[PDB]
Amino acid sequence: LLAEAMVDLGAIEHNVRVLREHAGHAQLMAVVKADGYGHGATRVAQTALGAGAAELGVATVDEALALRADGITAPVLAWLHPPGIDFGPALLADVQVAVSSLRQLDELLHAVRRTGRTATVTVKVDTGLNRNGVGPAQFPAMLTALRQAMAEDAVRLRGLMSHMVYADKPDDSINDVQAQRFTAFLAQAREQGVRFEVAHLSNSSATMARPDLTFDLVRPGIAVYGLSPVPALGDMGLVPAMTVKCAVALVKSIRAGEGVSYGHTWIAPRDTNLALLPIGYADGVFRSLGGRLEVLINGRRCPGVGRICMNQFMVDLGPPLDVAEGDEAILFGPGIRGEPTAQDWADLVGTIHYEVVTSPRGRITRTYREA
Amino acid sequence: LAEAMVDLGAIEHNVRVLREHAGHAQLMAVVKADGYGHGATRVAQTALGAGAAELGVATVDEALALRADGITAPVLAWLHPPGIDFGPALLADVQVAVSSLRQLDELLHAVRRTGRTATVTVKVDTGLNRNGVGPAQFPAMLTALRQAMAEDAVRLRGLMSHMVYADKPDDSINDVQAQRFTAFLAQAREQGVRFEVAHLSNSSATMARPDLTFDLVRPGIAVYGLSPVPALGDMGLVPAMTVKCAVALVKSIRAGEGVSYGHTWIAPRDTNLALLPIGYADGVFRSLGGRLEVLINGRRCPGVGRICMNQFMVDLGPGPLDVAEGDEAILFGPGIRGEPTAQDWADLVGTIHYEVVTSPRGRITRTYREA
Ligand SMILES: Cc1ncc(COP(=O)(O)O)c(/C=[NH+]/[C@@H]2CONC2=O)c1O
Ligand SMILES: Cc1ncc(COP(=O)(O)O)c(C[NH2+]c2conc2O)c1O
Ligand SMILES: [Ca+2]
Ligand SMILES: [Cl-]
Numbered sequence: 001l002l003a004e005a006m007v008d009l010g011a012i013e014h015n016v017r018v019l020r021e022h023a024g025h026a027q028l029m030a031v032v033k034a035d036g037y038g039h040g041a042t043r044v045a046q047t048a049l050g051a052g053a054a055e056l057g058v059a060t061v062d063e064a065l066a067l068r069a070d071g072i073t074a075p076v077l078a079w080l081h082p083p084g085i086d087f088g089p090a091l092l093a094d095v096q097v098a099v100s101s102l103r104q105l106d107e108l109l110h111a112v113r114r115t116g117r118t119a120t121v122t123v124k125v126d127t128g129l130n131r132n133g134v135g136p137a138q139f140p141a142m143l144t145a146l147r148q149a150m151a152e153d154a155v156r157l158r159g160l161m162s163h164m165v166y167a168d169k170p171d172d173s174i175n176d177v178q179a180q181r182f183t184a185f186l187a188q189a190r191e192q193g194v195r196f197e198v199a200h201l202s203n204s205s206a207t208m209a210r211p212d213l214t215f216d217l218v219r220p221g222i223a224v225y226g227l228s229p230v231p232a233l234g235d236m237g238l239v240p241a242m243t244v245k246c247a248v249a250l251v252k253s254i255r256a257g258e259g260v261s262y263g264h265t266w267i268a269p270r271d272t273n274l275a276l277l278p279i280g281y282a283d284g285v286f287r288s289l290g291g292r293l294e295v296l297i298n299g300r301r302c303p304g305v306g307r308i309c310m311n312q313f314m315v316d317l318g319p320p321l322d323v324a325e326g327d328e329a330i331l332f333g334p335g336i337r338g339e340p341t342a343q344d345w346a347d348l349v350g351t352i353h354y355e356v357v358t359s360p361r362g363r364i365t366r367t368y369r370e371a
Numbered sequence: 372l373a374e375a376m377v378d379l380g381a382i383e384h385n386v387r388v389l390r391e392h393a394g395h396a397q398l399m400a401v402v403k404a405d406g407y408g409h410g411a412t413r414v415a416q417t418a419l420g421a422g423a424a425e426l427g428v429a430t431v432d433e434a435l436a437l438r439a440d441g442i443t444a445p446v447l448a449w450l451h452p453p454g455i456d457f458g459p460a461l462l463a464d465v466q467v468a469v470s471s472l473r474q475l476d477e478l479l480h481a482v483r484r485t486g487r488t489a490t491v492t493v494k495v496d497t498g499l500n501r502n503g504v505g506p507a508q509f510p511a512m513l514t515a516l517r518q519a520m521a522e523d524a525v526r527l528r529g530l531m532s533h534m535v536y537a538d539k540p541d542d543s544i545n546d547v548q549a550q551r552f553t554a555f556l557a558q559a560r561e562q563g564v565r566f567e568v569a570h571l572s573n574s575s576a577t578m579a580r581p582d583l584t585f586d587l588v589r590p591g592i593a594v595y596g597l598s599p600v601p602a603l604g605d606m607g608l609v610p611a612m613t614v615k616c617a618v619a620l621v622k623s624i625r626a627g628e629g630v631s632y633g634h635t636w637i638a639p640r641d642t643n644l645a646l647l648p649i650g651y652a653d654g655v656f657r658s659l660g661g662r663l664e665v666l667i668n669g670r671r672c673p674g675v676g677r678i679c680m681n682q683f684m685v686d687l688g689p690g691p692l693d694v695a696e697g698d699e700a701i702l703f704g705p706g707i708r709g710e711p712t713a714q715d716w717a718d719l720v721g722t723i724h725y726e727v728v729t730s731p732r733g734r735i736t737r738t739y740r741e742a
């Protein structure tokens with residue numbers, strides 16, 4: 001293969017088991033939206049469920065229907081629904097639906113009537129993120145409509161959910177504030193005669209660093225893939241599951257003073273050897289990594305030199321060579337063999353590892369190492 | 372949810388513009404990287420129908436996909452990993468550009484196994500120093516090619532090279548590369564080796580340095596309507612890709628309320644927001660957060676707060692609400708309606724429109740407007 005994103009499913013399993021320890025008695029909902037954060041929703045889902053995950057979480061019904069079509073029968077919740085969505089197929093596929101407005105519930109209820117299928121409903125309430133979540137003023141009317149729907153067996157009231165404002169800052173008081181708001185929302189449900197089976201607020205960071213804020217379920221995403229939910233604390237006993245690597249497509253000598261890639265942005269101070277790596281920014285190698293990233297080849301860090309092109313870039317191998325055409329170069333991974341990490345790319349680019357692992361594509365073929 | 376709508380009428384227009392600038396020269400439309408994100412097969416079909424004579428791609432794999440999709444026009448591939456079996460290319464009538472003596476031997480080995488004449492182009496280094504045959508090795512290559520031609524093992528179709536900095540067309544390096552390219556043609560003429568065609572020109576050279584046009588031009592970026600010399604304006608081209616999405620939610624917020632992760636934006640005034648259900652896993656670069664604008668019903672609306680994995684918020688302002696759920700937000704396009712361009716994104720995060728248009732993916736479904 002020209003290049004591959006190898007997902008280690010034994011790393012996934014290990015990370016799920018680590019997360020279950022932090023979750024204690026709370027059930028684990030593994031978040032596999034965005035094609036398993038670029039790792040493959042179905043294969044990751046299967047591994048996580050086998051490692052103790054109780055439920056799966058995705059953004060869209062389409063993501064849940066994809067898992068169902070691959071044979072997944074475990075519970076799946078979807079919480080982002082565009083205007084015009086037909087909830088019918090979700091109901092027929094035993095997909096759980098989180099509603100974030102009265103309009104969305106009314107749309108779900110029309111789908112229940114059309115399909116004859118009771119909806120397993122979760123309500124997504126806003127505790128601070130201010131995105132798609134029922135606002136505090138609208139929550140009582142939401143409870144009222146849910147109770148009436150429940151009283152006619154049109155819905156099963158499964159969940160109350162919300163999402164944390166900080167994905168990596170557990171010490172910030174907004175975490176405590178959101179957990180208090182969530183508790184007051186649960187008290188509002190009580191005064192309106194409504195009980196949810198379960199309530200959940202916690203992402204990877206809250207699960208691992210704020211276990212005092214854990215409700216009935218936890219919803220880890222980033223930590224399942226092994227990426228630290230609080231990078232300032234280290235790897236947190238997790239193992240990043242994705243290793244991006246590619247073959248050395250060409251070894252080229254150059255003389256001191258010669259330029260490389262478009263605009264000749266880098267000149268050779270000494271006679272040396274370069275390796276052409278046949279992936280580039282169309283494959284998810286951020287162009288802004290040019291002249292900053294390093295790759296690991298046969299145990300040594302080799303710096304990128306010159307601009308990253310659409311499907312290739314060059315690294316400096318130095319001046320006799322221990323690298324051959326066809327040898328493997330590691331761009332990032334868990335860091336076990338001394339290679340860069342997804343967090344290293346995030347630091348160089350000014351982003352987060354979430355964006356790094358959803359980047360590889362095109363020439364970078366996704367592959368799996370079994371547990 | 373969202374789409375990258377490719378206007379094939381724009382493609383047709385751009386190909387016509389490029390043929391006008393190419394004058395007598397035929398056009399090889401460059402459709403690598405799945406048509407720079409616009410769809411290699413659909414763009415190739417359209418470009419051929421507007422008078423492109425040939426197609427260019429990086430890999431044989433890319434060429435074989437075009438062939439599998441029913442493309443019968445000539446296709447040239449110019450980036451091959453070491454140890455490739457050129458058999459499949461030869462059987463599928465894929466032209467092969469060789470960039471080293473070793474690669475030519477790989478090709479002639481495949482000619483011997485298959486019994487099919489190779490239609491060969493020689494890719495020569497005139498200063499890019501990426502791949503390409505150097506002047507030191509070119510005389511030996513000509514001697515070998517003359518011997519393969521004699522036995523009909525190769526048809527000597529093309530000589531090619533690639534410009535280092537043609538988007539700075541006044542730079543002398545362009546003249547220098549063309550003179551080196553001429554020296555290669557001269558070296559072949561004096562050694563009694565004749566190529567059917569020679570081509571040096573990318574989009575920039577084609578549009579801005581017609582004095583450097585040989586027998587063919589090889590435009591990629593301009594076929595997609597993206598300016599090959601941004602500083603000169605649109606150069607009479609029309610960007611073919613419009614990235615747009617449905618407004619998923621409209622909501623009011625109060626002054627002092629934070630939005631999105633980390634509350635990195637605090638509302639300075641009561642205002643209305645729109646939730647746009649695409650994010651960095653869909654190619655909306657996270658670094659655009661708080662910098663980009665979208666167009667909704669003729670008005671520019673700034674992004675506010677962090678861009679999330681699959682959604683971000685825009686500020687509709689406190690004026691009369693003129694946006695509804697279900698309305699269309701344009702992220703970038705040609706600019707005909709006042710929307711931002713791909714170049715605008717490139718300016719904002721410090722890249723080039725090439726990378727912008729190879730980014731949209733995920734929830735951003737590729738769609739086509741017929742000519
Ligand atoms: C409702 C809900 N519950 C749990 C998770 C999982 O959160 P993480 O454990 O931090 O991966 C997410 C994911 N949110 C993505 C991550 O990137 N930006 C986002 O908007 C989520 O929307
Ligand atoms: C041999 C050859 N010939 C023509 C074109 C067309 O280049 P353009 O007209 O600028 O789109 C390209 C593509 N040059 C690149 C731009 O970004 N990454 C690249 O590798 C090419 O490699
Ligand atoms: Ca409308
Ligand atoms: Cl390439």
Ligand SMILES: [Cl-]
Pocket residue numbers: 059080680681682
């Ligand atoms: Cl989302």
